[PDB]
Design a binder for this molecule. Structure first.
Ligand SMILES: Cc1cc(/C=C/C#N)cc(C)c1Nc1ccnc(Nc2ccc(C#N)cc2)n1
Ligand SMILES: Oc1ccc(Br)cc1
Ligand SMILES: [Mg+2]
Lengths: 415, 556
């Protein structure tokens, strides 16, 4: 109830980000939401002396009919000071990714109970646009901690730890992690049990609150069933020239990741100028080289380490048939995680919706494992992505992304 | 008197670290000084400016200009320096309404609110920065010093602070009168409605009563401006809209500047005149920006000009938006990377038209271009109407399904239906997913010496067919494409091709149907004539048979 002083970083002005076009349905939803936020004192109208702006839109969280306002504070978060005053940073819990059940709760509504430093509010300005710019956009700023701002969990930290103390003391094996507006709660209990402790946890903040519109929801994960993708080679009784060519190609690629990979004996099978569909018997030197390569590929990659000071990078490949592969790394050929999806939901005829869901799942994975979001290299043209991703977005955070315009050969080796 | 509600002041600051202006007042003739003194005395009488003491250290120069063909003088306070030092504001006018998003109105009345413009109070703490000085006669007395109390014309914040003040005054009226629309342009309010003229004229009276609460008087002698309105280059009528007259000049010789202004008019016209084209005319301004240079119009550009003149022969109008009906957008391919479209709700009554041009790129194809045009219309339609139109596209449903399922990128086009109007967008070739049984296998390679630019391209096949061609003024990348071309030229209708060129596979994997490179274009031509093509990649210099043999033939 007393404001924490907040600053931007040195020699850095506030965000001046253009509001992108919003559909009629999202505008009307935001008008209704902001009218009731203004009545509750959460936001106030601002004048033309404030030239700052952050984009806003609206989403529907997974399995909900009600619109949620989502501010894209990515620029403000970059330009906001770093909060290491009381804590250099809560260390990231490495045990969260090892629990059988992790449920994600939207606790962002709790932030609205803390006032925002009156000198910093101007930088949270946003605009509700009108269709065809026929009426002046409605200009607001925040009077309280906004959802999506990196400073909100930091300033509210002190308050959150004290709200959760009774639950943490009574349930010591539970790992609770806070990222932006999300609360990740992991346990090793039977899901029936699990859901009941989550419900117990929801009560602690309704009690303290005494209403949050989305606190009742629950996004359940299972990071111990998480799968990874080692490099595997085909097992065949009949190898065509083409098969062996693809094998040597894949092995050549793997040799950038694994030192001792060899292809000399396998290349030796191709000697001559043969039809691609001709069957080639493996000699025993080629079978041994191949077996030796298989055993190399069952060991971990050498010299792979996470550094919290460097960016995480996520690459995604479209494999077809609703299948997507992805890798997370900081240094080339030093993958920290790899994976594959196929269960993309209600998007059998929409690649962009599938990709958007993959980006969200990968980002969720990254939050649980390292506590931060990766920078995505997306296999999509920027104009297609920018026109549609907001239509399928259901998370309360937004990662960073760049566009891949040249087809990678590596797609073949991850399929 | 009747109490008036005051206009609250917007707090204004100078840019951080910047102080106010201190600009020397230029010497003036005795006749301009007496003109400025009388002008400023009446401004002072009206509360616009106030005389200040000598303590204020700031100053902005003032000038006297003759309204031409008049013995009347006019004041000009040059705020250029203060504007450089004044903070940035929020600008609402950046987005201009598109006429095609407006709604039909039976009546539109115009009200003059100039009284309000020159009567919005200025932040008390900022007034000092607006100080100016009338020089004294013969410089024998101190100049007369004044500062502004109202919003100064020519000051950076005056347009934004006026608009915001007016909007705040009007919001209660608009909210409680949802049957009318109000728009502020310059010092005029435009009020439109569908009501009966009497119910409408009452609303106007009511709006005048509301404005009088802030002391804002509106001329009783109603405005002279009436439909049609000339606005932002458009003509607005009650039930239709268009662009102001587009007149393409006759010229025996054309210069850079003339072509720029011709293309500008064509671009402006293309939002309601269907089919406008500007590719060949824009090609003339490639690279060069010497406004006085003459460029001979090519035959292609004369045809495009002639085609545009016949499109612009006679007026065309757009209709307004009916929210109760769906939006339809239809696209046609025009050639040379040009696309045109029309957006309508009832047949033959366009809301607006437009065009899209191929983005700069080494290689491209029609499907990618059609996709980009759809995204552009989608985004434009969200802006103007807040919704995506249903699309009518010259591409078969089967062609789109094959393209999206097999393309290496994610891609998507919103709800659409095939419209069978040539030229249709199609896939010109499709590579095989598996090697072809019974088809000859061509192992291709090329190489070039980086010094002399001498190279070789060629192939060897499983049937013993071989070719190597010596090349001049070439590069490794060019010889790799030439090798693939030779394999296509010398093979039958089905062919397997094995290359080690990552460069060549990057290009072909992108599925171009036309290219900047005539060599890629020759490859595309050959691909189109095949029945089946399987392209296989192998890593170089790894002892792979076929690939090893031809590599040594070409790098010799
Ligand atoms: C943008 C705008 C410019 C002018 C005018 C600016 C100037 N000069 C006048 C008005 C009233 C508006 N605002 C809106 C809002 C919604 N529908 C309309 N439809 C509409 C507007 C004018 C005519 C006419 N004639 C017909 C329909 N206008
Ligand atoms: O009374 C008013 C005069 C001008 C403006 Br702008 C707003 C209110
Ligand atoms: Mg070679």
């Amino acid at each position: 109830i007393e404001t924490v002083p907040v600053k931007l970083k040195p020699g850095m002005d506030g965000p001046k980000v253009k509001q992108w076009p919003l559909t009629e349905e999202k505008i009307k939803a935001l008008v209704e939401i902001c009218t009731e936020m203004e009545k509750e004192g959460k936001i106030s109208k601002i004048g033309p002396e404030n030239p700052y702006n952050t984009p806003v839109f609206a989403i529907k969280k997974k399995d909900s009919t009600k619109w949620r306002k989502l501010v894209d504070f990515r620029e403000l978060n970059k330009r906001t000071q770093d909060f290491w005053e009381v804590q250099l940073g809560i260390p990231h819990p490495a045990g969260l990714k090892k629990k059988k059940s992790v449920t994600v709760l939207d606790v962002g509504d709790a932030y609205f109970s803390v006032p925002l430093d009156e000198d910093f509010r101007k930088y949270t300005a946003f605009t509700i646009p009108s269709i065809n710019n026929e009426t002046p956009g409605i200009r607001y700023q925040y009077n309280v901690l906004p959802q999506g701002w990196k400073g909100s969990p930091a300033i509210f930290q002190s308050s959150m730890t004290k709200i959760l103390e009774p639950f943490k003391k009574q349930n010591p094996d539970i790992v609770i992690y806070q990222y932006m507006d999300d609360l990740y709660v992991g346990s090793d209990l039977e899901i029936g049990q699990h859901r009941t402790k989550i419900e117990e946890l929801r009560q602690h903040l309704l009690r303290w609150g005494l209403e949050p519109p989305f606190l009742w929801m629950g996004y359940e994960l299972h990071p111990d069933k998480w799968t990874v993708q080692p490099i595997v080679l085909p097992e065949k009784d009949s190898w065509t020239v083409n098969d062996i060519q693809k094998l040597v190609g894949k092995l050549n690629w793997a040799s950038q990741i694994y030192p001792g990979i060899k292809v000399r004996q396998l290349s030796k099978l191709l000697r001559g100028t043969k039809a691609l569909t001709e069957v080639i018997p493996l000699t025993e030197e080629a079978e041994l080289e191949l077996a030796e390569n298989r055993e190399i590929l069952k060991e971990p990659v050498h010299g792979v380490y996470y550094d919290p000071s460097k960016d995480l990078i996520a690459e995604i490949q479209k494999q077809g048939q609703g299948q997507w592969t992805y890798q997370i790394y900081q240094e080339p050929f030093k993958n920290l995680k790899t994976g594959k999806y196929a269960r993309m939901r209600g998007a059998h005829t929409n690649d962009v919706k599938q990709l958007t869901e993959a980006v969200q799942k990968i980002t969720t994975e990254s939050i649980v494992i390292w506590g931060k979001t990766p920078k995505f290299k997306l296999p999509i043209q920027k104009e297609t992505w920018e026109t549609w991703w907001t239509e399928y977005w259901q998370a309360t955070w937004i990662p960073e992304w760049e566009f891949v315009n040249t087809p990678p050969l590596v797609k073949l080796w991850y399929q | 008197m009747v109490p008036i509600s005051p206009i609250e002041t917007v707090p204004v600051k100078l840019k951080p670290g910047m102080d106010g202006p201190k600009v020397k007042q230029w010497p003036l003739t005795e006749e301009k000084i007496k003109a400025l003194v009388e002008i400023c005395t009446e401004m002072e009488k009206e509360g616009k400016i106030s005389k200040i003491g000598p303590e204020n250290p700031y100053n902005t120069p003032v000038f006297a200009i003759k309204k031409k063909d008049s013995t009347k003088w006019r004041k000009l306070v040059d705020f250029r320096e203060l504007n450089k030092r004044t903070q940035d504001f929020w600008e609402v006018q950046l987005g201009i309404p598109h006429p095609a998003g407006l709604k039909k109105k039976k009546s539109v009345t115009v009200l003059d609110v100039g009284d309000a413009y020159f009567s919005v109070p200025l932040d008390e703490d900022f007034r000092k920065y607006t100080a100016f000085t009338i020089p004294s006669i013969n410089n024998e007395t101190p100049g007369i010093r004044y500062q502004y109390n109202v919003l100064p014309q020519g000051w950076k914040g005056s347009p934004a602070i006026f608009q915001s003040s007016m909007t705040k005054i009007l919001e209660p009226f608009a909210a409680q009168n949802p049957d009318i629309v109000i728009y502020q342009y310059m010092d005029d309010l435009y009020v439109g409605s569908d009501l009966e003229i009497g119910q409408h004229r009452t609303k106007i009276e009511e709006l005048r009563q509301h404005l009088l609460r802030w002391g804002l008087t509106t001329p009783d002698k109603k405005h002279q401006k009436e439909p049609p309105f000339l606005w932002m280059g458009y003509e607005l009528h009650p039930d239709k809209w268009t662009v102001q007259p587009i007149v393409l000049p006759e010229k025996d010789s054309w210069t850079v500047n003339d072509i720029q202004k011709l293309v500008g008019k064509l671009n402006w016209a293309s939002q309601i005149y269907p089919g406008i084209k500007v590719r060949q005319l824009s090609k003339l301004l490639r690279g060069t920006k010497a406004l006085t240079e003459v460029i001979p119009l090519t035959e292609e550009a004369e045809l495009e000009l002639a085609e545009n003149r016949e499109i612009l022969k006679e007026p065309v109008h757009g209709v307004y938006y009916d929210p109760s009906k769906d939006l339809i957008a239809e696209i046609q391919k025009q050639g040379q990377g040009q696309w045109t479209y029309q957006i309508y709700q009832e047949p033959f009554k366009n809301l607006k038209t437009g065009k899209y041009a191929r983005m700069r790129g080494a290689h491209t194809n029609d499907v990618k271009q059609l996709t980009e045009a759809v995204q552009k219309i989608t985004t434009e339609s969200i802006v103007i109407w807040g919704k995506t139109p249903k699309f009518k596209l010259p591409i078969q449903k089967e062609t789109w399904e094959t393209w999206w399922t097999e393309y290496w990128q994610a891609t998507w086009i919103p709800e659409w239906e095939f419209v069978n109007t040539p030229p249709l967008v199609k896939l010109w070739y499709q590579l095989e997913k598996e090697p072809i049984v019974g088809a000859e296998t061509f192992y291709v390679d090329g190489a070039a010496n980086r010094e002399t630019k001498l190279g070789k391209a060629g192939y060897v096949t499983n049937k013993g067919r071989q070719k190597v061609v010596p090349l001049t003024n070439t590069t490794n990348q060019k010889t790799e494409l030439q090798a693939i071309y030779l394999a296509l030229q010398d093979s039958g209708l089905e062919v397997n091709i094995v290359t080690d060129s990552q460069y060549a596979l990057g290009i072909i994997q992108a599925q171009p149907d036309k290219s900047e490179s005539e060599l890629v274009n020759q490859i595309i031509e050959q691909l189109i004539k095949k029945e089946k093509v399987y392209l296989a990649w192998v890593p170089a210099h790894k002892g792979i048979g076929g690939n090893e043999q031809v590599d040594k033939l070409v790098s010799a």
